Structures are given as structure tokens and as C-alpha cells.
């Protein structure tokens, strides 16, 4: 038991499935021991939380509440009951292009929206693409993410090798968004084939292959999927397609004649919904503290209840 949550079974810092007592809603709670972190780690943890609070997209795992005690930080997250795309791929082998496209339109919307908010993810990979109960994508794990500006190449060469842009294996100060564009190409490849385009016996092999930038196109892959891959997986970062360019690509829009993929528009805030507010008032909250919590984006217990009532 913690705050307004009854903690239930472990599902993954431990991650525990929990129920919000006031709303009865199911959530995933990350339990993080602060004591045993170092300054650097602590700093990155505050950054990760700040980043998660900024992102509000239907295919990004939602943060509901932050609970702090001396020794423990609790992050109350949206629960994605379908598990990782990684384990889905292992169970089903691969996705037919139509299914891959359904996932990949949601992936691309989500990441292009991160970029709109001036956030690079930096660990886009199958394990970080979760699936909710309706088989929608929910992007997770902002542990390597950072804010960026266009007047600033980035400095830190973090990622996961098979998904990492070659400039990262090199020493090379880089434009952040472009790194996520490469990783997205690798994802696309792995959704349609069920295999990774760059690997080897060891990381020195993997590295060499990534830096050559050559990958094999299986014979079943459509011409459109092949041509799309070519816009992501380009060695020179400044000629990789932009995500806005990539949204208009043919493969992305097959079956979407009337509904081309376009950048996500963040909904206006609604902090004064009469239905949710009434319910909360009869739970004993007041309108005044709902307003302060929501307008202040506090992610405290009040804000969490309001959010959970709309989910």
C-alpha cells in the first residue's frame, strides 16, 4: 500500500501493478530506491521525470502521479497489459505490412510529437514499445532522453547497439532528432521481418556492420517498404529524411487515402470538466485544489485522481 494505491503483483527498480483506491483504476507503479543512487543518477532521474510530465500523446505511456519519500520515488504510470513489442515479435515471428503499418503510424506520430516538444528519446527499440489492451502502441522508457535545441549538437553517445545511429558509435557531436530517425528505421525493419538488420557474433561485428550501413532486403518485402527504409537508414545524418517528410511517404499511407499521417496536435487542456469535478467533490476534494493541482501540473494526488477519472 502507498498513497491512494493498493500495490498488487510485481510485473517488472521494481514495477508493481496497483489499483487506485478512489477510482478503482489499474496502474503500473515504478518503485525507485533513491538512497543507493549517485549524484549523476539522481540528476538523470529528475530529468526523466521532468520529461515524462511534458509528454501527452495517446501512444506514449502516461505519467499519472509522482510520490516522494526520503528513501523512495514512486512513479505511477499507465499500465500496458499487452507487454513489449519485442515479446510480441518473438511470439508471432513478424507483422504483415498492414499490421506493421498500424503500429508504425502510431510509433512515428509519438516520436515526431516528442520532437515537437524538443525531446529526443534515444532508446527507441522493440523492448521500449509497449502494447495496451487494445493493441495500441505505448512508447516507454525515457531514461536516455533529453531536451534539445537546434542551436546545439548533443554530446553523449548513449543507446542500444543494434538500434544506434553510426554517429553515436563514432565520437560525433550530433543533431538529436536524426538519431531517433535512424532507430525508427531499425524498428521498421524488425517489425516487418522479425529480425534485426545489424548484428553479429559480438559488438565489434555489430559496430562494423552498422558503420558500413548495409543491410539485407528480404525478397518478400514490398518495394514501398524497401524505399521507406532507405529514408531512415542513411549513414550521413543530414540526408536522412525528416519525420514530417516521412509521414507523407507512400508506405505510411497505404489504405489511408483520406487520412494522411500528419503531426499530432496536442489537445487543449480541460481542467474544469464538470463531471470529473463533481465526482471528486463528493470524494471530498474541493474545486480550488483541483484547479491549483492541474494548473500547476503538480502530479500530486489530486491531479492523479482527476486524470484517472478520464482514462
Amino acid at each position: 500500500h502507498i498513497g491512494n494505491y493498493r500495490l498488487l503483483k510485481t510485473i517488472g527498480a521494481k514495477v508493481k501493478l496497483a489499483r487506485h483506491i478512489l477510482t478503482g483504476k489499474e496502474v503500473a507503479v515504478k518503485i525507485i530506491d533513491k538512497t543507493q543512487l549517485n549524484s549523476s543518477s539522481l540528476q538523470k532521474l529528475f530529468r526523466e521525470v521532468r520529461i515524462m510530465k511534458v509528454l501527452n500523446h495517446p501512444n506514449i505511456v502516461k505519467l499519472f502521479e509522482v510520490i516522494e519519500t526520503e528513501k523512495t520515488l514512486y512513479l505511477v504510470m499507465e499500465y500496458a497489459s499487452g507487454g513489449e513489442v519485442f515479446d510480441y515479435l518473438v511470439a508471432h515471428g513478424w507483422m504483415k505490412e498492414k499490421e506493421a503499418r498500424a503500429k508504425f503510424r502510431q510509433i512515428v506520430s509519438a516520436v515526431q510529437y516528442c520532437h515537437q516538444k524538443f525531446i529526443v528519446h534515444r532508446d527507441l527499440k522493440a523492448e521500449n514499445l509497449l502494447l495496451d489492451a487494445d493493441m495500441n502502441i505505448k512508447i516507454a522508457d525515457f531514461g536516455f532522453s533529453n531536451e534539445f535545441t537546434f542551436g546545439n549538437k548533443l554530446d553523449t553517445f548513449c543507446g542500444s547497439p543494434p538500434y544506434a545511429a553510426p554517429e553515436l558509435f563514432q565520437g560525433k557531436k550530433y543533431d538529436g532528432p536524426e538519431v531517433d530517425v535512424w532507430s525508427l528505421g531499425v524498428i521498421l525493419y524488425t517489425l516487418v521481418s522479425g529480425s534485426l538488420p545489424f548484428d553479429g557474433q559480438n559488438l565489434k561485428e555489430l559496430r562494423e556492420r552498422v558503420l558500413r550501413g548495409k543491410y539485407r532486403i528480404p525478397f518478400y518485402m514490398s518495394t514501398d517498404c524497401e524505399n521507406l527504409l532507405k529514408k531512415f537508414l542513411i549513414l550521413n545524418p543530414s540526408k536522412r529524411g525528416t519525420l514530417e517528410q516521412i509521414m507523407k511517404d507512400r508506405w505510411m499511407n497505404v489504405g489511408h487515402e483520406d487520412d494522411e499521417l500528419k503531426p499530432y496536435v496536442e489537445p487543449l487542456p480541460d481542467y474544469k470538466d464538470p463531471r470529473r469535478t463533481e465526482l471528486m467533490v463528493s470524494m471530498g476534494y474541493t474545486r480550488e485544489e483541483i484547479q491549483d493541482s492541474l494548473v500547476g501540473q503538480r502530479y500530486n494526488e489530486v491531479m492523479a485522481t482527476y486524470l484517472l477519472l478520464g482514462y
Binding site: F144, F157, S160, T190, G194, L196, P197, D199
Partner: peptide
């Protein structure tokens, strides 16, 4: 190549 998990890495230049 076969789909498998790799460790995250803080500094891929090594």
C-alpha cells in the same frame, strides 16, 4: 539477424 535483447550503453564510442 535473430531478434535478441542487448544491454543499453551510456557511451557507444567504445
Amino acid at each position: 539477424f535473430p531478434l535478441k535483447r542487448h544491454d543499453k550503453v551510456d557511451d557507444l564510442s567504445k
